[PDB]
Amino acid sequence: MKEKIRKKILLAPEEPGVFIFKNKGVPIYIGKAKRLSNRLRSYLNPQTEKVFRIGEEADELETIVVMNEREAFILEANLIKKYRPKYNVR
């Protein structure tokens, strides 16, 4: 994993949000979290081959902090529909 992505993961807040891994400007995986810190730190010790792949292929990580868990649910669904990222199921 790129050093700048590891750093961004370790700085993420204990707040609800949506995250987007990208390569060459294109989203490759979109997810949501009750706490961005907890969900993103799981990428450092991969429990599945898919989590390993996403973290090695990415050249960028964007995070979006939201108002609450209701907003996280709808924003994540809308962005998956818009971008159809390679690692999200269809």
List residues near Mn ion by CB under 5 A: 1, 4, 31, 48, 60-61
* Nearest to Mn ion of 4, 82 (CB atom): 4
Contact status, residue 22 vs residue 58, Cβ threshold 8 Å: yes
Q: Tell me how far, at minimum, the Cβ of 67 lies from Mn ion, in Å.
A: 18
Q: Which residue number, 15 or 60, has a Cβ lying nearer to Mn ion?
A: 60
Instruction: Indicate the SS3 state at residue 11.
Output: helix
Contact (Cβ atoms closer than 8 angstroms) between residue 21 and residue 79: no
**In the complex, what is the shortest distance from the CB of residue 30 to Mn ion, in angstroms, rounded to a whole number?**
7
